[PDB]
Design a protein around this ligand. Structure first.
Ligand SMILES: OC[C@@H]1O[C@@H](O[C@H]2[C@H](O[C@@H]3CO[C@@H](O)[C@H](O)[C@H]3O)OC[C@@H](O[C@@H]3OC[C@@H](O)[C@H](O)[C@H]3O)[C@@H]2O)[C@H](O)[C@H]1O
Length: 530
């Protein structure tokens, strides 16, 4: 396939950093209070991406990341725009991110990637907390320079550059205000580069432009001068704001590409790719289509690229086998590890024991989530719910700050299917605004039905950002082994607001309104494109 179409991945992976090691491209994204945090995706062509690891296996940023006492928890805090690079000299990946005023470094060995055309064996990833720096590198962009000195560009509304110690664990020096926009416009989203002898920093003007800065002195400390890379460019997707932020990366053939993202709410922020050309005077420019738009299709960045993949694809059936989750799953806040187990053996399965007593889904620990692929997808959870106890509520949630679910309520000796809507957080502070209402009752389910209940969410995430239209999701259940599905409840209208940042997700939850002791088994999950 000699060309590709935008977007390259229709899944919420915001604040991307991209770089190349040998034959492999790596992409790092932001995850807020979702745990594990800071996913890493891998590609051979900048187009087909597979998740391979997460840089922060459990969030270590403070006790609120364990959701100890309900809303506002650490909702919409945690990992904002951060940065990742691979250091050849010690075969180590470095992830830095500022969270609530301190900067955290997590590192992993690379399994000798520099020597194996950039491949990291799946077993070699092993991320550990390596340092904390007592300066906030808001919207950090790491550069490992050609002489092995490490720098971080950061800031909002103006850009600073810090020099780190040789081991990357301490700040040695900061130059403040290496760039300020001359008309007082806010910039942020720094990514930092050393390209053919010169220093570049990419910054965004939220949320519609990207500037390229270049050091006027040839020093990493600048000062820097700017040119526009994109400003309010049209395409390649409608109703998804503007392509901005992101970063630039070289393919093995020496050609450069700009990987930006779109505000494709209600789905989230998704990556788009364009080629770059370099001017004779040493600046990069986006290659547009014949109409000056970010093109819907372009030549493939790598020809005859490897197609091999690690682990389960986004749409692959996941029966929760083995000892670890696939790279697609993330908990809402850190999980209580004493309250879930992956069963292993022939069948696998995930046991979710109730971990929180609450009437409020947003206060519940151990809600397991994953990204919805767009523009439309069905997510199906298969459960055994015989272990539910009085007051337990479990099910499949369309999860965000305006949420709905289809699930099972156990009251006394009755288990029944319900559809619940009007679950809402207040965008001003993220306290609960509504704990929901039963919008429809489904049937009472007997023990045989309880042993195999299938819960289905059909979500439409077709972009609607900036429009007056809200997309809708519908909910279904099966109590005949997935052979027949029955619709339950109204169509649920989804928010287009950007304030929660993360897109809508599919999730499975289990909590109690009375007491702990109950459990469900999640036998499987499947996402189908619809
Ligand atoms: O378009 C959705 C996302 O917005 C960008 O993120 C920043 C955001 O930008 C506003 C988006 O809507 C515009 O109409 C408006 O004019 C933009 O300002 O809001 C600002 C910012 O968060 C702030 O960052 C600095 C920090 O110190 C503040 O506490 C924090 O509120 C946010 O990053 C993003 O580009 C796009 O995806």
């Amino acid at each position: 396939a000699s060309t590709f179409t935008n977007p390259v991945l229709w899944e919420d992976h915001p604040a991307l950093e991209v770089f190349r090691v040998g034959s492999v491209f790596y992409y790092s994204s932001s995850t807020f209070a979702y745990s594990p945090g800071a996913p890493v995706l891998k590609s051979y062509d900048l187009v087909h991406w597979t998740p391979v690891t997460h840089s922060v296996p459990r969030l270590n940023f403070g006790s609120n990341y364990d959701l100890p006492s309900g809303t506002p928890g650490a909702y919409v805090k945690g990992i904002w725009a951060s940065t990742l690079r691979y250091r050849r000299s010690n075969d180590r990946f470095y992830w830095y991110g500022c969270v609530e005023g301190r900067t955290y470094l997590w590192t992993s060995p690379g399994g000798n990637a520099l020597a194996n055309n950039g491949e990291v064996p799946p077993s070699a990833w092993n991320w550990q907390h390596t340092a904390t720096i007592d300066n906030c590198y808001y919207d950090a962009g790491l550069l490992i320079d050609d002489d092995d000195t490490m720098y971080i560009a950061y800031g909002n509304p103006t850009i600073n550059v810090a020099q780190l110690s040789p081991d990357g664990t301490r700040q040695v020096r900061v130059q403040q205000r290496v760039y300020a926009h001359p008309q007082g416009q806010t910039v942020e989203g720094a990514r930092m580069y050393k390209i053919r002898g010169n220093y570049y920093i990419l910054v965004t003007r939220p949320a519609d432009a990207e500037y390229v800065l270049r050091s006027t002195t040839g020093s990493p400390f600048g000062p820097y001068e700017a040119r526009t890379l994109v400003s309010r460019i049209q395409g390649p997707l409608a109703n998804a704001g503007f392509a901005h932020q992101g970063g630039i990366v070289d393919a093995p053939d020496g050609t450069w590409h700009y990987v930006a993202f779109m505000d494709a709410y209600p789905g989230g922020r998704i990556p788009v790719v364009a080629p770059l050309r370099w001017t004779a005077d040493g600046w990069p420019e986006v290659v547009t289509d014949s109409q000056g738009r970010w093109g819907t299709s372009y030549p493939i960045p790598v020809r005859g690229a490897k197609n091999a993949t690690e682990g389960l694809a986004s749409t692959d059936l996941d029966e929760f086998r083995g000892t670890r989750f696939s790279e697609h799953w993330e908990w809402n806040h850190n999980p209580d590890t004493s309250k879930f187990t992956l069963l292993g053996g022939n069948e696998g399965g995930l046991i979710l024991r109730t971990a929180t007593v609450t009437g409020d889904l947003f206060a519940a620990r151990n809600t397991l989530t994953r990204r919805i692929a767009g523009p439309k997808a069905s997510g199906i959870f298969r459960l055994d719910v015989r272990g539910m106890r009085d007051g337990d509520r479990a099910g499949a949630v369309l999860f965000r700050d305006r949420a709905a679910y289809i699930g099972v309520w156990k009251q006394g000796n009755e288990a029944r299917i319900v559809m619940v809507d009007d679950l809402r957080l207040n965008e001003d502070g993220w306290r609960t605004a509504s704990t929901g209402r039963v919008a429809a009752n489904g049937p009472v389910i007997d023990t045989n039905a309880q042993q195999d209940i299938w819960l289905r969410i059909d979500a439409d995430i077709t972009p609607a950002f900036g429009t007056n239209t809200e997309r809708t999701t519908t909910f279904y259940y099966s109590i005949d082994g997935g052979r027949t599905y029955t619709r339950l409840g109204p169509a649920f209208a989804m928010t287009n607001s950007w304030r929660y940042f993360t897109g809508y997700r599919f999730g499975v939850f289990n909590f109690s309104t009375k007491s702990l002791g109950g459990e469900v088994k999640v036998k499987g999950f499947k996402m189908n494109m619809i």
